[PDB]
Amino acid sequence: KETAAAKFERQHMDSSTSAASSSNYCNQMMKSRNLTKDRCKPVNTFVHESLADVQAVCSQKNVACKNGQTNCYQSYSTMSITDCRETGSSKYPNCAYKTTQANKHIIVACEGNPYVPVHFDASV
Numbered sequence: 001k002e003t004a005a006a007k008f009e010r011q012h013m014d015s016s017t018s019a020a021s022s023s024n025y026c027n028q029m030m031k032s033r034n035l036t037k038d039r040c041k042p043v044n045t046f047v048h049e050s051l052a053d054v055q056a057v058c059s060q061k062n063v064a065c066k067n068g069q070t071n072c073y074q075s076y077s078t079m080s081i082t083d084c085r086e087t088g089s090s091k092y093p094n095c096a097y098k099t100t101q102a103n104k105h106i107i108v109a110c111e112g113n114p115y116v117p118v119h120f121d122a123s124v
């Protein structure tokens, strides 16, 4: 059954693109990654980097998570990210997202062995 580490890949990794190509990016990715299966997930970040480089974050700058846990790590460098946010016209099963492209540091929580990301905490 899906692992938290496979689930982070599915929801958050798009190594296949450098950046989101059009205003549609979010709509199609949210749908194709099955993030809008039971309802419209309202925020979701995709990261346009190699999996190894996002796994490395687990050994970068250790920081508190937004919720106060201390297994959160912030990337030493900025990454190319797409921010996806639900719009006023979103309506399940027709979930609708704003596509914002950015270059920011990313903060994830890590677990397990190998010690890998399993939640996207924030971009900064």
Ligand SMILES: Nc1ccn([C@@H]2O[C@H](CO)[C@@H](O)[C@H]2OP(=O)(O)O)c(=O)n1
Pocket: 011, 043, 044, 045, 118, 119, 120, 121, 122, 123
């Ligand atoms: N900038 C952000 C903020 C939040 N999240 C996702 O939105 C969720 C609820 O706020 C977070 O938990 C995270 O999901 P996940 O934990 O599945 O990585 C995200 O992807 N990007």
